[PDB]
Amino acid sequence: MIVLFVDFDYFYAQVEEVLNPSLKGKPVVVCVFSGRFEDSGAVATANYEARKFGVKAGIPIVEAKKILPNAVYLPMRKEVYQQVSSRIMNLLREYSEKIEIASIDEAYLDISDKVRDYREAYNLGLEIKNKILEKEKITVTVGISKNKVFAKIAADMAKPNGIKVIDDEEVKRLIRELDIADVPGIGNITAEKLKKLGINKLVDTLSIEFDKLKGMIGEAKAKYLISLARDEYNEPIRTRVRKSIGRIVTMKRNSRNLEEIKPYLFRAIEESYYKLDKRIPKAIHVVAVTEDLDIVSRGRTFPHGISKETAYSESVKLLQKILEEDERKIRRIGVRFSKFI
DNA sequence: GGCACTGATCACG
DNA sequence: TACGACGTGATCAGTGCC
Ligand SMILES: Nc1ccn([C@H]2C[C@H](O)[C@@H](COP(=O)(O)OP(=O)(O)OP(=O)(O)O)O2)c(=O)n1
Ligand SMILES: [Ca+2]
Ligand SMILES: [Ca+2]
Ligand SMILES: [Ca+2]
């Protein structure tokens, strides 16, 4: 199987630059202003001029200003990037019926039936990078190999504005030399559990007892890691169906006063229902981000779809179930809808 | 023993 | 004033049930 992975470059920043060209060359920082105070919130993404200096996704907007006080800071316009994205994705649908849209800026294409080899694959990529630059003037890195995982690792190595192949032979080299923490799906918490077992390379997972690996990271993560190690990772490209749609808002000040929380909950419900558009949920979950940042939640499944009215009333009951079952203070309240009809 | 749901955990964008 | 005017998919461990 031959898989082609497309990953738009520093996306939110790039789309901003494309909407206002004068921004090119200057460091740009797309942020999420929380509203609490002057410059509170986090950074969603920074273009490369800004990343060179340590300004990356996740750091507090105030920390980014200490580093680049004169960078152009813009407010995240998620709806905008989303539309640009949908237009770029549509373009990719001309290159394979089998396409898996991983996220807002990543797509997997199974080109097994469009090219006979990596040479033809690599040329299809180029054609695809161009087609996107033409129509939308957006650069994107292309990763290519036998499966989704190595295609992704491919791209990770090529970006920005690059392209790369990882043939069967390099896959074997990587199964041996590639740091196991750079394997899609291996977060910090797991990477550690592995280093705590002397596992640093994919191959190292074949010499350990299965249950010892299972017990430490989980049966699913172990099998995952093992198949990649045996070089038998097979996961077909499948059209993704959004399973849930929610929204979580930060409150002006923490608290556990139902009446002072309601507005935020109903607000979250409103936006959620807007985003639902035509999709009817049968399950509603109220999510809370306690003062100490833990995540608490309570839900309910109905044998029928949920009218907004039902969501409104039922959400309050669940919010309560969280107040009667926890004593900490809430910082971020929200709703989350699933099990669509 | 094993299928099927629920609140928490991890990873990632 | 130290992970978000942020989100979503997947697995896990507990437990209800034939
Ligand atoms: N912590 C994060 C990570 C990503 N994103 C959003 C903004 C990014 O622009 C977009 C795509 O994610 P990537 O991790 O691919 O980041 P970039 O596209 O910005 O950069 P690059 O792909 O060049 O590394 O998702 C976000 O809001 N918060
Ligand atoms: Ca990415
Ligand atoms: Ca990207
Ligand atoms: Ca990692």
Side-chain angles (χ1 to χ4, degrees):
Chain A
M1 173 181 62
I2 301 183
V3 182
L4 189 153
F5 181 66
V6 171
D7 187 336
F8 321 157
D9 298 293
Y10 62 91
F11 203 53
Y12 294 14
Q14 217 195 324
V15 182
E16 282 301 356
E17 296 177 357
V18 160
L19 261 53
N20 166 2
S22 76
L23 288 175
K24 269 180 285 186
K26 317 176 174 190
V28 178
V29 188
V30 192
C31 340
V32 169
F33 294 115
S34 50
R36 292 194 143 187
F37 59 78
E38 185 74 309
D39 298 321
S40 69
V43 176
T45 184
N47 59 15
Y48 286 98
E49 277 76 59
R51 279 192 210 167
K52 282 183 305 196
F53 304 117
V55 180
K56 57 182 182 184
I59 68 174
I61 302 174
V62 155
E63 295 319 298
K65 291 196 165 177
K66 292 181 174 177
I67 303 165
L68 282 191
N70 306 308
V72 182
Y73 294 70
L74 301 177
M76 185 191 253
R77 310 196 286 150
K78 181 71 169 288
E79 333 64 55
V80 179
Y81 321 139
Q82 184 56 69
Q83 265 165 31
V84 184
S85 175
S86 290
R87 298 205 306 269
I88 303 180
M89 289 308 166
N90 287 320
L91 290 194
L92 298 174
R93 299 177 193 297
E94 302 296 294
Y95 303 95
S96 177
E97 306 66 44
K98 307 172 184 179
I99 184 185
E100 187 180 304
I101 302 173
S103 61
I104 188 165
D105 80 326
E106 295 180 1
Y108 288 96
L109 282 72
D110 185 341
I111 49 175
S112 298
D113 307 319
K114 312 295 181 177
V115 305
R116 302 174 270 173
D117 51 55
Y118 289 150
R119 186 189 64 78
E120 274 175 58
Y122 185 111
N123 297 335
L124 174 60
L126 285 166
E127 187 191 313
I128 294 181
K129 283 171 56 78
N130 292 319
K131 178 65 60 178
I132 289 174
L133 192 56
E134 300 183 327
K135 303 288 177 178
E136 302 282 2
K137 294 291 143 43
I138 292 287
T139 63
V140 312
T141 290
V142 168
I144 300 181
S145 196
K146 46 200 293 188
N147 56 46
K148 296 195 293 162
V149 178
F150 282 105
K152 181 153 168 50
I153 295 172
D156 286 341
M157 304 176 293
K159 60 173 50 175
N161 195 359
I163 175 171
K164 166 167 184 53
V165 180
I166 286 177
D167 59 58
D168 293 31
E169 187 168 62
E170 178 162 29
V171 167
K172 296 193 75 176
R173 183 179 68 70
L174 290 175
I175 293 184
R176 262 184 287 106
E177 317 179 327
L178 176 65
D179 189 340
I180 205 173
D182 293 342
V183 168
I186 308 306
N188 273 187
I189 293 183
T190 299
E192 187 52 53
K193 291 179 174 174
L194 290 185
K195 180 177 186 173
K196 212 160 222 173
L197 294 181
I199 298 185
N200 312 291
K201 311 291 177 178
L202 265 163
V203 59
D204 303 320
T205 60
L206 301 167
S207 62
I208 183 174
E209 174 185 47
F210 181 68
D211 306 302
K212 184 189 173 190
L213 182 52
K214 171 176 170 183
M216 189 73 354
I217 58 173
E219 168 186 53
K221 225 122 209 173
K223 303 191 170 187
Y224 171 70
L225 281 178
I226 291 174
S227 79
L228 280 166
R230 290 177 181 155
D231 185 9
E232 308 181 343
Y233 176 74
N234 102 302
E235 273 305 310
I237 277 64
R238 67 173 60 269
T239 304
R240 228 174 282 205
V241 187
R242 189 158 294 314
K243 296 183 165 103
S244 84
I245 279 180
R247 168 81 172 175
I248 208 293
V249 306
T250 289
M251 309 189 283
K252 184 66 174 186
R253 80 176 208 227
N254 306 346
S255 159
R256 15 187 310 117
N257 173 290
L258 172 60
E259 286 306 305
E260 169 180 32
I261 283 177
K262 280 191 170 176
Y264 290 117
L265 184 76
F266 299 152
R267 260 176 273 175
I269 294 181
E270 281 310 311
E271 290 168 45
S272 304
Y273 256 83
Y274 169 69
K275 303 184 190 176
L276 273 184
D277 172 57
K278 306 308 168 193
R279 277 168 306 212
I280 314 298
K282 302 195 300 289
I284 170 180
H285 282 262
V286 172
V287 186
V289 172
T290 71
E291 49 193 353
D292 56 299
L293 308 185
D294 249 52
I295 302 178
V296 188
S297 71
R298 299 298 183 287
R300 166 161 186 171
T301 302
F302 289 71
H304 52 274
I306 310 166
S307 65
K308 193 205 287 178
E309 290 76 354
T310 300
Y312 263 96
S313 57
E314 184 61 28
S315 55
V316 186
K317 295 180 184 181
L318 300 157
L319 165 48
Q320 283 197 281
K321 191 181 299 183
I322 287 184
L323 255 21
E324 297 166 351
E325 287 170 47
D326 193 298
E327 73 190 314
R328 292 171 288 176
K329 285 183 166 185
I330 295 180
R331 177 180 156 117
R332 306 185 61 194
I333 191 59
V335 71
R336 180 124 220 115
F337 298 86
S338 54
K339 297 176 184 178
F340 312 143
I341 303 174

